[PDB]
Design an enzyme around this catalytic site. Structure first.
Site, PDB file in Angstrom:
ATOM      1  N   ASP A  31       0.821  -1.206   0.000  1.00 24.65           N
ATOM      2  CA  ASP A  31       0.000   0.000   0.000  1.00 24.65           C
ATOM      3  C   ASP A  31       0.835   1.227   0.000  1.00 24.65           C
ATOM      4  O   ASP A  31       1.366   1.648   1.049  1.00 24.65           O
ATOM      5  CB  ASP A  31      -1.058  -0.011   1.065  1.00 24.65           C
ATOM      6  CG  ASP A  31      -1.949   1.233   0.839  1.00 24.65           C
ATOM      7  OD1 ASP A  31      -1.888   1.717  -0.238  1.00 24.65           O
ATOM      8  OD2 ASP A  31      -2.709   1.608   1.737  1.00 24.65           O
ATOM      9  N   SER A  48       2.484  14.842 -12.955  1.00 26.13           N
ATOM     10  CA  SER A  48       2.391  14.544 -14.349  1.00 26.13           C
ATOM     11  C   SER A  48       2.479  15.742 -15.276  1.00 26.13           C
ATOM     12  O   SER A  48       1.907  16.825 -14.973  1.00 26.13           O
ATOM     13  CB  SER A  48       1.135  13.650 -14.626  1.00 26.13           C
ATOM     14  OG  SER A  48       1.272  13.157 -15.981  1.00 26.13           O
TER      15      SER A  48
HETATM   16  C1  2Z3 Z   1     -11.351   6.740  -3.279  1.00 28.50           C
HETATM   17  C2  2Z3 Z   1      -9.875   6.687  -3.361  1.00 28.50           C
HETATM   18  C3  2Z3 Z   1      -9.222   5.643  -2.494  1.00 28.50           C
HETATM   19  C4  2Z3 Z   1      -9.751   4.228  -2.556  1.00 28.50           C
HETATM   20  C5  2Z3 Z   1      -8.625   3.166  -2.400  1.00 28.50           C
HETATM   21  N1  2Z3 Z   1      -9.261   1.821  -2.392  1.00 28.50           N
HETATM   22  C6  2Z3 Z   1      -9.405   1.150  -3.576  1.00 28.50           C
HETATM   23  O1  2Z3 Z   1      -9.019   1.605  -4.579  1.00 28.50           O
HETATM   24  C7  2Z3 Z   1     -10.108  -0.229  -3.411  1.00 28.50           C
HETATM   25  C8  2Z3 Z   1      -8.916  -1.265  -3.355  1.00 28.50           C
HETATM   26  C9  2Z3 Z   1      -9.520  -2.588  -2.884  1.00 28.50           C
HETATM   27  C10 2Z3 Z   1      -9.438  -3.721  -3.749  1.00 28.50           C
HETATM   28  C11 2Z3 Z   1     -10.009  -4.882  -3.283  1.00 28.50           C
HETATM   29  C12 2Z3 Z   1     -10.646  -4.992  -2.075  1.00 28.50           C
HETATM   30  C13 2Z3 Z   1     -10.740  -3.857  -1.231  1.00 28.50           C
HETATM   31  C14 2Z3 Z   1     -10.170  -2.681  -1.696  1.00 28.50           C
HETATM   32  N2  2Z3 Z   1     -10.923  -0.557  -4.624  1.00 28.50           N
HETATM   33  C15 2Z3 Z   1     -12.055   0.048  -4.920  1.00 28.50           C
HETATM   34  O2  2Z3 Z   1     -12.529   0.903  -4.193  1.00 28.50           O
HETATM   35  N3  2Z3 Z   1     -12.723  -0.295  -6.066  1.00 28.50           N
HETATM   36  C16 2Z3 Z   1     -13.976   0.362  -6.393  1.00 28.50           C
HETATM   37  C17 2Z3 Z   1     -14.021   0.576  -7.854  1.00 28.50           C
HETATM   38  O3  2Z3 Z   1     -13.785  -0.715  -8.506  1.00 28.50           O
HETATM   39  C18 2Z3 Z   1     -12.405  -1.087  -8.275  1.00 28.50           C
HETATM   40  C19 2Z3 Z   1     -12.170  -1.308  -6.902  1.00 28.50           C
HETATM   41  C20 2Z3 Z   1      -8.004   3.351  -0.968  1.00 28.50           C
HETATM   42  O4  2Z3 Z   1      -8.729   3.624  -0.042  1.00 28.50           O
HETATM   43  N4  2Z3 Z   1      -6.736   3.133  -0.900  1.00 28.50           N
HETATM   44  C21 2Z3 Z   1      -6.025   3.018   0.421  1.00 28.50           C
HETATM   45  C22 2Z3 Z   1      -5.705   1.636   0.828  1.00 28.50           C
HETATM   46  C23 2Z3 Z   1      -6.709   0.532   0.641  1.00 28.50           C
HETATM   47  C24 2Z3 Z   1      -7.852   0.571   1.558  1.00 28.50           C
HETATM   48  C25 2Z3 Z   1      -8.884  -0.543   1.531  1.00 28.50           C
HETATM   49  C26 2Z3 Z   1      -8.156  -1.898   1.517  1.00 28.50           C
HETATM   50  C27 2Z3 Z   1      -7.108  -1.968   0.497  1.00 28.50           C
HETATM   51  C28 2Z3 Z   1      -6.097  -0.833   0.487  1.00 28.50           C
HETATM   52  C29 2Z3 Z   1      -4.842   3.987   0.414  1.00 28.50           C
HETATM   53  O5  2Z3 Z   1      -4.080   3.785   1.549  1.00 28.50           O
HETATM   54  O6  2Z3 Z   1      -3.928   3.725  -0.702  1.00 28.50           O
HETATM   55  C30 2Z3 Z   1      -5.253   5.465   0.390  1.00 28.50           C
HETATM   56  F1  2Z3 Z   1      -4.274   6.248  -0.091  1.00 28.50           F
HETATM   57  F2  2Z3 Z   1      -6.204   5.655  -0.445  1.00 28.50           F
HETATM   58  C31 2Z3 Z   1      -5.594   5.963   1.754  1.00 28.50           C
HETATM   59  O7  2Z3 Z   1      -6.746   5.953   2.273  1.00 28.50           O
HETATM   60  N5  2Z3 Z   1      -4.623   6.588   2.472  1.00 28.50           N
HETATM   61  C32 2Z3 Z   1      -5.035   7.084   3.829  1.00 28.50           C
END
Ligand code: 2Z3
EC number: 3.4.23.22
Length: 330
Positions: free
Chosen positions: A35, A199
């Site tokens: 992450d 970018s």
């Molecule tokens: C709206 C913008 C951010 C959304 C991003 N999450 C995502 O992108 C999640 C990833 C996931 C895949 C499978 C199962 C569960 C989650 N996917 C998702 O929301 N989708 C919805 C759209 O279809 C595609 C998948 C996020 O919160 N990223 C986190 C870390 C995740 C959190 C949930 C579990 C997996 C890792 C992050 O740390 O990178 C962050 F930067 F976004 C963050 O919140 N920093 C504080």
């Protein structure tokens, strides 16, 4: 010292990538989502509320000889998609890919939200953003990478995500077999604790490149590409039945479209995301409407280069004292 680990998509849309990590003595193996927009190593555990665990593999610190409770530390995180977890903290040895770190804080979940409970193949997270973001109070803890960085041949890691296929995270070294031509590196801003870069602009299909600075973060833990509402309108205007949908919350498109590619700028270099990586897939089992991989950031408030963008590239996070981000074609 170096380490080299295989990450593998969790499902056939590459929604996320899991990477085996060894915690404890003897090793417990859990598969963690790597992450780069968060700075907490947290795991399913023995102490996790029982009704919130569902097929995940749990860390049992009771069984590890190296595990020490870090007395009074607590932690509590919440992420972009509204998921959350919190609980308590041990330190313990962690290996990734042959690279061992002793004294790593491993944050042990007591409570995870429903979203976590639901996702059986992810047994917790390994944050790789900047240590400023770690949420352990009252003493903030360092990342895995920051702890390694001493030992590393080279204080870089690299991310090399696959399109429907396994991919590799490397610590300590750059595999010059993993990419073609040269890496372009570009400055990072650490101010908000993200690998923040800018970018140089974008092209849609075989259109003209527009020069225009898009500030975003390189985020291996975020599935899609989230761009300003302008850039994003430009792209989907080139897809015949595409529209923005209120029920879906997103840009949808008829499954039968071909998508054009998207180019993004890195200095004078260009990275090109093939149209098919953008094809998320059917929005609901058996619908003729597909969900797109390029989504507006207006509502979120930063631009995210997520896995759609970074699986197009070989990416170096150079965690020198002045950090940089390097991109190459592969
Ligand atoms: C709206 C913008 C951010 C959304 C991003 N999450 C995502 O992108 C999640 C990833 C996931 C895949 C499978 C199962 C569960 C989650 N996917 C998702 O929301 N989708 C919805 C759209 O279809 C595609 C998948 C996020 O919160 N990223 C986190 C870390 C995740 C959190 C949930 C579990 C997996 C890792 C992050 O740390 O990178 C962050 F930067 F976004 C963050 O919140 N920093 C504080």
């Amino acid at each position: 010292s170096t380490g080299s680990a295989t990450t593998t998509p969790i499902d056939s849309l590459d929604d996320a990538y899991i990477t085996p990590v060894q915690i404890g003595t003897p090793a417990q193996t859990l598969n963690l989502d790597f992450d780069t927009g968060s700075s907490d190593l947290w795991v399913f555990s023995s102490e996790t509320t029982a009704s919130e665990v569902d097929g995940q593999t749990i860390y049992t610190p009771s069984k590890s000889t190296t595990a020490k409770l870090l007395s009074g530390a607590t932690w509590s995180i919440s992420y972009g998609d509204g998921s959350s977890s919190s609980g308590d903290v041990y330190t313990d040895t962690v290996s990734v890919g042959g690279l061992t770190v002793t004294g790593q804080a491993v944050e042990s979940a007591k409570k995870v939200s429903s979203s976590f409970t639901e996702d059986s193949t992810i047994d917790g997270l390994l944050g790789l953003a900047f240590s400023t973001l770690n949420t352990v109070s009252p003493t903030q803890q360092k990342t895995f990478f920051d702890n390694a960085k001493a030992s590393l041949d080279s204080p870089v890691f690299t991310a090399d995500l696959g399109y429907h296929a396994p991919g590799t995270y490397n610590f300590g070294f750059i595999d010059t077999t993993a990419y073609t031509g040269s890496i372009t590196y570009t400055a990072v801003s650490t101010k908000q604790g993200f690998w923040e870069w800018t970018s140089t602009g974008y092209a849609v299909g075989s259109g003209t490149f527009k020069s225009t600075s898009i500030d975003g973060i390189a985020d291996t833990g975020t599935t899609l590409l989230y761009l300003p509402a302008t850039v994003v309108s430009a792209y989907w205007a080139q897809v015949s039945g595409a529209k923005s949908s209120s029920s879906v919350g997103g840009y949808v498109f008829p499954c039968s479209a071909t998508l054009p590619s998207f180019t993004f700028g890195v200095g004078s270099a260009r990275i090109v995301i093939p149209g098919d990586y953008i094809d998320f897939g059917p929005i609901s089992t058996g619908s003729s409407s597909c969900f797109g991989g390029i989504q507006s950031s207006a509502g979120i408030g930063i631009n995210i280069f997520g896995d759609v963008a970074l699986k197009a590239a070989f990416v170096v996070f150079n965690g020198a004292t002045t950090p940089t981000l390097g991109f190459a074609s592969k």
